[PDB]
Write a structure and sequence with these properties.
The structure is a homodimer of 383-residue chains. Chain A is globular and about 60 Å long. Chain A has helices at 20-27, 38-42, 45-55, 72-85, 96-110, 185-204, 210-232, 235-255, 259-271, 275-290, 297-304, 314-331, 348-357, 370-381, and strands at 2-5, 9-12, 31-35, 59-63, 89-94, 122-123, 133-137, 149-154, 159-164, 172-175. Chain A folds into 2 domains: 9-179, Rossmann fold, CATH 3.40.50.1970; 185-381, Dehydroquinate synthase-like, alpha domain, CATH 1.20.1090. Chain A is α/β, with parallel strands linked by helices. In chain A, strand 8 and strand 9 (159-164) form a beta hairpin. In chain A, the strands form 2 sheets. A 6-stranded parallel sheet of chain A has the order 2-10-7-5-3-4, with helices on both faces. Chain A contains 14 helices and 10 strands. The complex binds 1,4-dihydronicotinamide adenine dinucleotide (2 copies) and fe (iii) ion (2 copies). The site of one fe (iii) ion has 6 residues of chain B, from helix 6 and helix 10. Chains A, B: Pfam families: ADH_Fe_C, Fe-ADH.
């Protein structure tokens, strides 16, 4: 049997954070800890929420110490703030980094034996649900608001580790493009191809089944249709991306991804490479590696990405899907090589071992060896 | 902004009730009231759940007094059992009737100011969540396990009233075709076209948007592909129908349906007509009435119902969709006229007024007058 964890309550569309004060009142919560970063405070994005909260007379404190690729230290700092704040719920405002941080705080806060943070890794044997989380994405996106995974950086060990826990699922997600319009184009592009990577790896993952297939192929269609326009600054394209990134989550959270996420995590841990950029560069190279274990599914990808696949045989359609992703990466200004974003040749053997041992690699529809991952990094390295 | 209420946790596939004992233990519940009917006790379908529960050492009581089109009297009997049982949670085993009954008991049981049952009608202003509900459908189906609506019969007033409450959403749904194989073919057919009706009315409802559209058109595809085979007794067709009926719910619960449900509720209340059979007879007639306010959407329906649309104008495609539903109704043995299932000509004026006042009618993409609903019943009535 296949399990689906989803958000019990989700609000979709420009103005969706408009619903938050009434959700909080109907739930009887008394005080929020908002988990976010200095940038979203600075740019006035957190204020879009706190202004409404203040107008409704709802108490909030704020932790803004989250850094991209959130570390064990960030989780413990935020945990310390929550525990002294008196908060009875959490509001995650940000991308993956604040949202994963918020999941770790919420879990540890109702399961205090996990406050070392490392022991949460894998299928966390938590007894209690997370402190309730209201999740507000500001990137488009990691789909953190609807996934049961969160990823934390162990600095001492130089590795991103995955915590998977149904207890961490947010009680409400607010998917509101107003909260996303301030993303620089490069951030829209990087988080866009992240979303696309989720949808494409979810579509072809070992555990894929009819429902996740339907969700994933619709998310690829929405993302491929909207990203160029969103990066260009189109309003409706921004709103489409907010939805597409989410729908991808509904799928990949429940069945997994593959070697792209597997190979992107070591780059995060070694170099602090943004997750989306690492995914964007690796995606077409890994799709080429996977092509022969994906049945007719690349034909579907090619079609929804606007390639005329009528008549074109399966081998040509598989290549047109890989090329449509190369073309998207170029069109939205993602650098094409790992060397352009600070990766070192010398590190590839160690990166490849960490990629092979990454839990996300298990979902890849083609069995990867150390030497295959070594070769793949070398292919993404430089011309 | 658009809201989605879904199941936080759902298990899909043959053997899905296999997960119930683990879900109960993880949740720390002490004692279930199972809400069901004498038929599912008699046919040994309840035992498929209680045998696993007994093997896991889990306490259960049982209320088996639910009748099709569950009355106020059934809700109060079940309420009385729950309140004296000591149960801390509910397991709904059945079709719409036990599942809607279980939602009413769960709500009333944590919201004692609604125990008259009539006051729950509409957007019930409940303060408290329902007693937690684990939902196990045995028909394919009403999608009750995932909807926020429930429908109760006021015998004295001769009317089905709709209660809409996010507090009633089941904590976990187990969608397990093993629990559905015992349905007589006529019940598979009647609940099948119910599922199809939900998906088609959801697809064209006034509140329809991108997410519900994707869910609905995928559910029409699954249902139209599997129903004939399921009615014939095909195993995999049965499993497909279990999924399709659910996916339809994920949509229509969150945006609504239309005039088919609106006109079927009076038949329930006047005659105790099965819901699905009334939906099946009315569906193609209402679809023809709606055709011109459905954009390109009947062309989508025609395609996924296996009509060759390659070089077909939208007018012809709209008619082929109406005809594909007539053809399905014939092939699965649904009587074609309202007169064949015990409706009276003399009642049509009163039925039409009750249909017009039914809250479900509001979603219809074409504004219905009394005269239009009168005419529609007359069209479905006889040769
Ligand atoms: N929880 C899960 O299931 C998943 C986890 N992840 C994790 O998510 C993280 C990546 O999160 P992302 O959203 O890609 O970025 P992020 O949350 O790391 O943020 C990147 C940077 O963009 C800035 N930023 C974010 N939103 C902005 C906005 N609206 N306007 C202006 N600046 C803004 C932030 O302040 C930050 O400096 C990684 O740690 C990755 O491992 C990725 C996918 C799935
Ligand atoms: N909750 C919601 O949002 C919705 C509500 N409904 C409600 O659902 C009700 C109709 O529910 P249905 O599921 O169509 O039927 P039902 O639950 O009323 O049952 C119909 C008959 O079939 C029998 N049966 C059910 N499963 C069986 C199985 N596996 N094997 C043998 N016999 C079986 C039952 O014992 C019963 O006698 C109506 O009262 C309607 O208003 C309908 C759809 C949506
Ligand atoms: Fe990702
Ligand atoms: Fe129905």
């Amino acid at each position: 049997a296949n399990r689906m964890i989803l958000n019990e309550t989700a609000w979709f569309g420009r103005g969706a954070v408009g619903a938050l004060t009434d959700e909080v009142k109907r739930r009887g919560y008394q005080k929020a800890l908002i988990v976010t970063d200095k940038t979203l405070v600075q740019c006035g994005v957190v204020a879009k929420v706190t202004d409404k909260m203040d107008a409704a007379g709802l108490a909030w404190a704020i932790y803004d110490g989250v850094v991209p690729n959130p570390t064990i230290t960030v989780v413990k700092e935020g945990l310390g703030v929550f525990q002294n704040s008196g908060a009875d719920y959490l509001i995650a405002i940000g991308g993956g980094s604040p949202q994963d941080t918020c999941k770790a705080i919420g879990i540890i806060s109702n399961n205090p034996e996990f406050a070392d943070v490392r022991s949460l890794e894998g299928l966390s044997p938590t007894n209690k649900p997370s402190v309730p989380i209201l999740a507000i994405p500001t990137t488009a996106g990691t789909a953190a608001e609807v996934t049961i995974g969160y990823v934390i950086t162990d600095e001492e060990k130089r590795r991103k580790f995955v915590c998977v826990d149904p207890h961490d699922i947010p009680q409400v997600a607010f998917i509101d493009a107003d909260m996303m319009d301030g993303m620089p184009p490069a951030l829209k592009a990087a988080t866009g191809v992240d979303a696309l990577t989720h949808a494409i790896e979810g579509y072809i993952t070992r555990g894929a089944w009819a429902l996740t297939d339907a969700l994933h192929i619709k998310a690829i269609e929405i993302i491929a249709g909207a990203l160029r326009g969103s990066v260009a600054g189109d309003k409706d394209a921004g709103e489409e991306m907010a939805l597409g990134q989410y729908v991808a989550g509904m799928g990949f959270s429940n069945v997994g991804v593959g070697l792209v996420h597997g190979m992107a995590h070591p780059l995060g841990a070694f170099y602090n490479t943004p997750h989306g950029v690492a995914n964007a560069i690796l995606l077409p190279h890994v799709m080429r590696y996977n092509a022969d274990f994906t049945g007719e599914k690349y034909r579907d990808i090619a079609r929804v990405m606007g390639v005329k696949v009528e008549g074109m045989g399966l081998e040509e359609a598989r290549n047109a899907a890989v090329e449509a992703v190369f073309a998207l990466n170029r069109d939205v200004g993602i650098p094409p090589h790992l060397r352009d974003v600070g990766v070192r040749k010398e590190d590839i053997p160690a990166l490849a071992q960490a990629a092979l041992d990454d839990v996300c690699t298990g979902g890849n529809p083609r069995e990867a060896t150390l030497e295959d991952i070594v070769e793949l990094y070398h292919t993404a390295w430089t011309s």
